[PDB]
């Protein structure tokens, strides 16, 4: 699977632009916001759209994906079914930093563990990780090795789990239980800051310690 | 002043019908929910009911204000603007119990720190207390030295202070500088639990020690 980042809003959200080799179809994983700057990268890229994804209801991850899902003509797909209240809440969300209202979102459908998301000839895995909001889902390409993963996991650190509905505890243990053992040599993409490998965080990570 | 609390929704929130005992003029603190139930103590009290007041944007306060005011021609005055982003979050904040949808809520108008409500010859002080949130505002009536504060202030608690934009130092703060200094002889109806007096609180208060 290729890939291109896009860091995106005053967040600075690591949206993800990801596609097949042969077939050239792709997806747009968190498109949260800064719609014109991801439709550029997009159409500069020469693939063909086919999906939206969403790993978790938060402002940062999703802003965009109703605007571009009308102007591409694609369906907006996740997360899980208990971050609807996080995305009934997006004017909420937006109206609490001051920014522009950002209009409640209902995904074509959402996620459960175990489904299958297919960006051309890559098969996703889609492993239900909750803790940082309880609806947050990842993609898993098993061939590539290659997690993108939201705000469930970062270099050196984990997602807050003091929001609403947020458990460090529920957190930890999907980390532990549904991540790690996908390998140490899986490379992670998270919403914020630097790439790493779960390898690396299982032994360097403060929070995975025990 | 004469007052009946009305306990209304599944959080048992304490719900003020408070009115003139001369001109039988009343108002509203808190509709939360159960508007069934407050419509009927409020019509078999005879008073006159003028407006509806909110301490601050959160469901168990709120959810019955807009059928109310509809229902009784009356307008719906506060929280202080700040709260506005947890208005606009009611569908999400009821979505996230699990219970049916409420809607956005606008009030006729905002409050600020230092405004005067009129209900008939009862004058009620505005205070801006965040800390909780930070739109909260409380209501007090010098004359019959009564409080009527929503969830700042519990008979030996405090508001919580974890939820987003919630702020543990400032809600202490804003009780030791704005609530404490009005006296101990102070009464106080909070949100959740038995009334207290401002005095016993300053004295017993677990939170307000030191
Ligand atoms: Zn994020
Ligand atoms: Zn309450």
């Not at 990801?18 to 997009?42: H, S």
């Not at 209240?85 to 563990?113: H, I, K, V, Y």
């Not at 940082?132 to 990842?138: D, E, F, I, Q």
Request: charged share 20%; aromatic share 8%; glycine share 10%.
């Amino acid at each position: 699977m290729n890939y291109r980042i896009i860091p995106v809003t005053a967040f600075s959200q690591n949206c993800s632009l990801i596609w097949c080799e042969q077939t050239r179809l792709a997806a747009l994983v968190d498109p949260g916001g800064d719609a014109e700057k991801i439709k550029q990268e997009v159409d500069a890229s020469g693939v063909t759209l086919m999906q939206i994804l969403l790993t978790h209801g938060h402002l940062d991850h999703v802003g965009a994906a109703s605007e571009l899902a009308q102007h591409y003509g694609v369906p907006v797909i996740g997360p899980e079914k208990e971050d609807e209240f996080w995305l009934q809440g997006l004017p909420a969300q937006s109206r609490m930093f001051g920014l522009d209202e950002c209009q409640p979102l209902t995904p074509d459908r959402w996620l459960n563990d175990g489904d299958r998301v297919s960006v051309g000839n890559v098969t996703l895995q889609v492993l239900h990780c909750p803790g940082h909001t309880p609806g947050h889902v990842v993609f898993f390409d098993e061939q590539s090795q290659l997690l993108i993963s939201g705000d469930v996991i970062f270099k050196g650190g984990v997602g807050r789990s003091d929001f609403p509905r947020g458990d460090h505890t529920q957190l930890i243990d999907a980390i532990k239980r549904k991540l790690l053992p996908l390998g140490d040599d899986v490379t992670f993409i998270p919403g914020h800051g630097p790439l790493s490998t779960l390898g690396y965080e299982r032994l360097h990570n403060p929070f995975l310690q025990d």
